[PDB]
């Protein structure tokens, strides 16, 4: 996927 972040 592109154009999307990731938070943990």
């Amino acid at each position: 996927a592109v154009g999307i972040g990731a938070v943990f």
Partner: antibody
Framework: QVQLVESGPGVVKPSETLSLTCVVS??????????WSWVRQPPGKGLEWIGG????????DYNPSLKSRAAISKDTSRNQFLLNLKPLTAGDTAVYYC?????????????????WGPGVLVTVSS | DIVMTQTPLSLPVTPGEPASISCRSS???????????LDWFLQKPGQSPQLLIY???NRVSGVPDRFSGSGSDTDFTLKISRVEAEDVGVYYC?????????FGGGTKVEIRR
């Protein structure tokens, strides 16, 4: 990611520069990064992705349809990110939105962060 | 660019009846990790779009179970089992398997009276 606020001139002439600012009010802490995008909507038409950037980097992705007229930047210290457009055509009159997206793994289930500003109408006309 | 085609452009629905919105991509939206990168947004009148369904079939919190999403790699369907007044607005599909991000043309759902 709690709130996005757009600002900028409401009318710009075709030779001038369209400059927009998006101010990000963040939310609960987390590790990782967000992706911030500009999206525009001409009156009565659909959505077009202009470009964007991840918050951790200084590299911007651009829509080729925009003929390298767009310049997008960010400053997490100024909690802002910016759009500059030049030269302009009447075809660039539109509502401009800033957006923030991320996959959210902080909860027990996978979820999404997806926030849009209210948008600002920009009319290009002589 | 990946081309997204959405049908129909305008959908009048009598309250209580089902509605179906179709979307296609010109390429598979399946990415390396096996996820199908297709999201659905709803833009209510006089408001910004917001996320409704993500990764083909996952409902955002607060979205009623009346909304369901299905699809293959290239053909996707948003179904509303019984349409209510709060559902009116423009629905957009969007792919994010590759840059540039591209949207379907939108489907305007309105109340049939």
């Amino acid at each position: 990611q709690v709130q996005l606020v757009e600002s900028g001139p409401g009318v710009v002439k075709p030779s001038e520069t369209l400059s927009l600012t998006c101010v990000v009010s963040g939310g609960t802490p987390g590790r990782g990064f967000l992706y911030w995008s500009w999206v525009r909507q001409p009156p009565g038409k659909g959505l077009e992705w202009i470009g964007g950037t991840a918050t951790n980097t200084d590299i911007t992705d651009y829509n080729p349809s925009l003929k390298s007229r767009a310049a997008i930047s960010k400053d997490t210290s100024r909690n802002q990110f910016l759009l500059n457009l030049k030269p302009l055509t009447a075809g660039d009159t539109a509502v401009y939105y800033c957006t923030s997206r991320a996959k959210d793994y902080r909860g027990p289930s996978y979820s999404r962060i997806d926030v849009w500003g209210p948008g600002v109408l920009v009319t290009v006309s002589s | 660019d990946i081309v997204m085609t959405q049908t129909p452009l305008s959908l009048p629905v009598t309250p209580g009846e089902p509605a179906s919105i179709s979307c296609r991509s010109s390429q598979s939206l399946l990415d390396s990790d096996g996820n199908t990168c297709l999201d659905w947004f709803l833009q209510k009148p006089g408001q910004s779009p917001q996320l409704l369904i993500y990764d083909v079939s996952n409902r955002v919190s607060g979205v009623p179970d009346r909304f369901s999403g299905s699809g293959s790699d290239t053909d996707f369907t948003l179904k509303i089992s019984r349409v209510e007044a709060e559902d009116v607005g423009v629905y957009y599909c969007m792919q994010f398997v590759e840059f540039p991000l591209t949207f379907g043309g939108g489907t305007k759902v309105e109340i049939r009276r």
